Ligand binder design. Structure first.
Ligand SMILES: Nc1nc2c(ncn2[C@@H]2O[C@H](COP(=O)(O)OP(=O)(O)OP(=O)(O)O)[C@@H](O)[C@H]2O)c(=O)[nH]1
Ligand SMILES: [Mg+2]
Lengths: 18, 180, 261, 137, 322, 282, 147
């Protein structure tokens, strides 16, 4: 855990925009 | 027979694979190959002969054999047809007058029965000028949908920026390797 | 045999490639017409190992006039090899480029020749001097267009006495085939400079250095006396040709082997 | 996907209840992945909706579309931006490639009645991209 | 056009914001000392301030504390850093990480990164894993007048990422920008309308200007990539006489029933403040007031590897004075 | 002085520089040919740092040798030393013919070295009487812009200062300059944004308000001012002064910027006073 | 000015050849053996032969005759000196001068022949110096040759 919000994984790009 | 050594090699990665680099002259093929091998935009004179290099990515040694687009070197592509596993076609959207010639050359090269297991690999090079088309207009002009029994994939790569090369490499790996 | 050799040469294993290259070299030296496999060996040309590169270059030189059309697939390789950091590789590439007797290949070799003409490596300088002379012999008009005469003339006026001697020999060879027009003759300063490097030249370079004076004609007794005084030390050379060259030079300015007898 | 199957009936019921024509803040689930919907994921969702029904032929409405997008984002972490339709008048193609859902007239494009219709060619042909190359970059 | 930078002193031109007659003494106040840089010509005051800020940042990176104890203890490296930083009044290098490879307090040729265009990503960096941790820090600044209305209510975004990967990846940052959504045709969902976006040196200005493409090579360590800044027209999260109940404002400190009140002003210190329950020090994590959600991060490397990007959103109180 | 250890050499050079006017040519000449680029750069910096009239005469040869140094750090050090020598002795620099070498520096690789050469040329021309100006045609400006996108934060200011002297003559050239300077407004450095704003304001003297370029520039400049207004308190006074200077010229850009002009409770006196003036002007 | 240096044998077979100028056809070596036989049987045999417009000047080794074809007015003394230098180099590298090593050490022999003379002009003749750049069991050449 970590104060200030748990770190979340990030995507690679807009998959819905090609 | 025993295949324990093969399993041990595959546990850490054994397959390497191959690839080919063909297309018209001044199409960014040399720059793309340099970026894939080194990662820098190096300016070079037109490729009189050919360039052979390898790229190690995802535990696969992707050997690339760059081929120029010179008129005197166009008929020499048949030499590389022996012991070839991949083939990459680089389009030049900035040369409207050369589009027909490139299409004719691709058709002539694509009409060979020796190169059948090599899936299609179309790269949209020179993705830096406003005159470049999209990822569908070029495919429609080239008629890639009419290539029966051919696994083609349209990918746009910018020589100046380098974006889209990773996607093309991943697509090539997925087409070549059919495992987890 | 031929099919097996082609398959071995078209393999991705260096261990089999080296054996195939050795076998191909032996077959050519054994008296086997291996010119039909020249295009096959063309694929296995850009190799990191220097052992196979020399054999490939030798095969290409020996199989260049036989298949001039198939030799068009080596200009890029030669250009790439002309910029290798290793002086030995650059020298080998320069020697191989000039060894190819192809009319359509020397046109594109001018740029590498121009680049290697001013090479800091004395071996590279000598190789460039040899290549320029070879190109001039193959195509005098191409050499004249490339303007290599000026570079060759400055070669005698540069360091690396071996390179200076090589440049002098190349200039003498070019002028020998030349119609005497625009002769490369030099004033007494050039002769004195050559004599200065004459004492530092090797046994082979001594002949080259002494041949240049064979064309110069002295006009004064002081110049002839100085030339004789400088050529006097050449009579104490263990090489028979150096002594003979010195004797001939002295004559112009004025117990060996049975074969040399 | 058991969760998707369970949420499909409730989502369909909510969409049917809402006619065709209070809390502030943007809470985020801790560790919940958020990314745009992929072409394969969109195709799988379209196939599941077609098999389960309730989406093909349903009258297109802003509230129903928003509810469906919110449910999809909650159940999968996909941003509610890939469920876009091409501008009218006429048949609106999906903005995201791979989506098998499209809006077709049922009778100003805003007042035209539209209904969701399955389209297998959408996952293979980029109709929205071809129509609007500028929108696709 | 500074003549001599002094804290220790290091003359740059030898020709010598205050003004001692014909010489201007422009300097800022540090934690313990004022970095006064004498100047005589019509030098760029903004340039001098930027140089002073860069020097302060370099000192903070090299020395964990900015006090007189290190000035008299680290002169050997401090003098070298001062000499290398600026020559003839013109600074040439400002990367602390890059500078750490040529000047050390405990010398080989300078790295090619400074000579090369990419001076913010040292080549040859290799790690066992490729993990980049992002930090979407929220800054809620509210200027509420005595009449009860809010005058200055601006929220400034801050994307700080701790990149730790192998090689020289070219990150392609992608979020749900309002301009990007409008250009792509998706200007109907929740899009962040950032009035001002300040990209770092790694982000290419041309790419962002062309098609809003945020593509840049991240550095090795923690750095600020982008700094959004847009106005806010929503109600304040905390009303002192409103945030979502799902968010908890950890360490609520309202400087003037629940929470410890201690007088040092009266510090209304609250450990946890559930949603729906003078400067306030509220810091509610996992709450994005602006609603901007990161879309993708194009991690591309020449070698080729599977990155594991990560990022966290933290909402804190900035200029939230009443 | 001639010591192999680099740690003592730097201290010796610093002591000599600090004890040069109060009270080594062979040592500098020997150090000017060291293979290590760092040593050569240090020697070049120390040679120019010595304020001796009888020493700069013999330093021309090492400066000439290091002017065409292949090392980009060596090139930058040589450019700095040439400018220092010109400031110390303009006649000696002119006799040495370093102006031609400096001009070609902008037309060479190593964008950091090019920026350093441009800054040195600007400094030399600043003290020059305007005779034989180092101005260049649009090709030079385009080349600088090409290296502008590759310049660092410090080099950006140097690259933008050169355009401050050039005066556009056509709307197309002014439009291109504005388009190229537009990306500079998204720089995290306050000075880079301010430099871009100043360059745009200077170029606007030749732009046409009839075209949409002027309106786009005006719209894209307000967000930059708003961002700069949130800088450090020390830079707050500078930003206020810049706004006041540009307020009297183009008051239609920041017409709607009134909330951001409010003085904060913790704002400094130099910023609080400027806030009232900014509010009065707007 | 030798055109091609070749190594023959006692049976007329060329052990190894290395052209230097290429101005002489490689098939001219065939007539060298009959010419030598005719010269020997008539008492006119000499180390320097002449196949029409091409001179075949060579010496007799322990087991093979190192015939070096030439066409121009090359220095005969230079050719003899080069042949002697080559023989000395072979003796230094190979303890025996026989046909057993010609067919066994071609890998190094070819390299030595190529490095020794270029375009008919020899450049290096020191066996000890040459041993640091060409080996039968490659780094930059030593500076001694350049020096
Ligand atoms: N500036 C710029 N030029 C590009 C770009 N893409 C392709 N080019 C042009 O394409 C050419 C690519 O040449 P190389 O990469 O060296 O080799 P090649 O692509 O195989 O071309 P040939 O050697 O003639 O067959 C360059 O000379 C460029 O002029 C690009 O993204 N930016
Ligand atoms: Mg090429």
């Amino acid at each position: 855990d970590r104060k200030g919000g748990s770190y979340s994984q990030a995507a690679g790009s807009d998959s819905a925009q090609s | 027979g025993n295949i324990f050594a093969n399993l041990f090699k595959g546990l850490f990665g054994k397959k390497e694979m191959r690839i080919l680099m063909v297309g018209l002259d001044a199409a960014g093929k040399t720059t793309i190959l340099y970026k894939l091998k080194l990662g820098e935009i190096v300016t070079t004179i037109p490729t009189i002969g050919f360039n052979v290099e390898t790229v190690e990515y995802k535990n696969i040694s992707f050997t690339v054999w760059d081929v120029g687009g010179q008129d005197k070197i166009r008929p020499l592509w048949r030499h590389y047809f022996q012991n070839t596993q991949g083939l990459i076609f680089v389009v030049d959207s900035n040369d409207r007058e050369r589009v027909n010639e490139a299409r004719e050359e691709l058709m002539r090269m694509l009409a060979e029965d020796e190169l059948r297991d090599a899936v299609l690999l179309v790269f949209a090079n020179k993705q830096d000028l406003p005159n470049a088309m999209n990822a569908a207009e070029i495919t429609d002009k080239l008629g890639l949908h009419s290539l029966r029994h051919r696994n083609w994939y349209i990918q746009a790569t910018c020589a100046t920026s380098g974006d889209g090369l990773y996607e093309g490499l991943d697509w090539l790996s997925n087409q070549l390797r059919n495992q987890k | 045999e031929i099919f097996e050799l082609k398959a071995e040469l078209n393999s991705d294993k260096k261990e089999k490639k080296k054996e195939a290259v050795k076998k191909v070299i032996a077959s050519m030296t054994v008296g086997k017409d291996v010119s039909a496999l020249f295009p096959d060996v063309v694929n296995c040309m850009q190799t990191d190992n220097l052992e196979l590169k020399k054999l490939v270059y030798l095969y290409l030189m020996n199989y260049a006039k036989s298949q001039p059309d198939m030799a068009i697939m080596a200009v890029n390789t030669f250009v790439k090899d002309c910029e290798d950091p290793n002086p030995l590789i650059r020298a080998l590439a320069v020697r191989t480029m000039g060894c190819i007797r192809v009319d359509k290949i020397t046109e594109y070799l001018c740029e590498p020749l121009r680049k290697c003409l001013k090479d800091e490596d004395p071996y590279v300088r000598k190789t460039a001097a040899v290549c320029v002379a070879k190109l001039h012999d193959i195509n005098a008009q191409l050499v004249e267009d490339q303007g290599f005469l000026d570079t060759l003339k400055d070669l005698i006026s540069d360091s690396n006495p071996m390179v200076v001697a090589n440049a002098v020999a190349a200039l003498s060879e070019i002028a020998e085939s030349h119609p005497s027009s625009n002769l490369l003759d030099l004033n007494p300063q050039s002769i004195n400079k050559l004599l200065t490097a004459l004492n530092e030249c090797t046994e082979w370079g001594q002949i080259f250095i002494l041949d240049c004076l064979a064309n110069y004609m002295p006009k004064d007794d002081r110049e002839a006396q100085s030339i004789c005084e400088r050529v006097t030390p050449r009579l104490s050379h263990a090489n028979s040709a150096v002594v003979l060259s010195a004797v001939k030079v002295l004559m112009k300015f004025m117990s060996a082997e049975p074969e040399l007898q | 996907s058991k969760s998707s199957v369970i949420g499909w009936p409730a989502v369909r019921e909510r969409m049917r209840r809402a006619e065709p024509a209070e809390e502030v803040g943007f809470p985020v689930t801790p560790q919940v992945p958020l990314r745009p919907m992929t072409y394969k994921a969109a195709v799988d969702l379209s196939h599941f909706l077609k098999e389960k029904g309730g989406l093909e032929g349903l009258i297109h409405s802003q509230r129903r579309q928003d509810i469906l997008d919110l449910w999809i984002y909650h159940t999968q972490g996909y941003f509610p931006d890939w469920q876009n339709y091409t501008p009218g008048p006429g048949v609106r193609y999906p903005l995201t490639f791979g989506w098998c859902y499209k809006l077709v007239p049922v009778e100003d494009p805003e007042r035209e009645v539209l209904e969701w219709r399955f389209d297998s060619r959408l996952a293979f042909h980029h109709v929205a991209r071809e129509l609007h190359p500028e929108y696709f970059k | 056009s500074a003549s001599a930078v002094y804290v220790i002193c290091r003359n740059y031109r030898g020709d010598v914001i205050l003004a001692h007659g014909g010489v201007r003494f422009m300097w800022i106040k540090h934690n313990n000392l004022y970095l006064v840089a004498t100047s005589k010509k019509n030098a760029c005051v903004s340039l001098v301030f930027s140089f002073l800020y860069k020097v302060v940042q370099v000192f903070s990176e090299y020395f964990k504390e900015l006090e007189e104890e290190s000035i008299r203890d680290n002169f050997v490296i401090i003098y070298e850093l001062l000499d290398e930083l600026m020559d003839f009044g013109y600074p040439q290098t400002t990367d602390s990480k890059i500078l750490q490879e040529y000047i050390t307090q405990e010398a080989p040729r300078p790295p090619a990164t400074v000579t090369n265009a990419v001076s913010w990503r040292s080549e040859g960096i290799k790690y066992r894993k490729n993990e980049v941790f992002l930090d979407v820090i929220e800054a809620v600044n509210l200027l509420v007048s005595a009449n009860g209305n809010v005058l200055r209510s601006e929220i400034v975004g801050s994307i700080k990422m701790r990149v730790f990967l192998s090689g020289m990846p070219e990150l392609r940052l992608g979020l749900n920008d309002k301009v990007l959504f409008d250009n792509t045709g998706r200007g109907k969902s929740k899009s962040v309308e950032l009035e001002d976006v300040k990209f770092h040196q790694c982000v290419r200005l041309s790419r962002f200007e062309n098609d809003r493409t945020i593509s840049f090579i991240p550095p090795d360590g923690e750095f600020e990539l982008m700094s959004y800044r847009l106005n806010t027209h929503v109600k304040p999260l905390i009303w002192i006489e409103q945030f979502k109940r799902r968010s908890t404002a950890n360490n609520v400190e309202i400087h003037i029933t629940v929470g410890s009140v201690k007088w040092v002003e009266i510090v209304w210190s609250v450990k946890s403040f559930p949603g729906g329950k003078i400067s306030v020090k509220f810091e509610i994590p996992y709450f994005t007031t602006s609603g901007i959600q990161v879309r993708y991060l194009k991690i591309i490397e020449k070698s080729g590897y599977q990155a594991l990007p990560w990022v966290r959103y933290i909402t804190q109180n900035g200029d939230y004075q009443l």
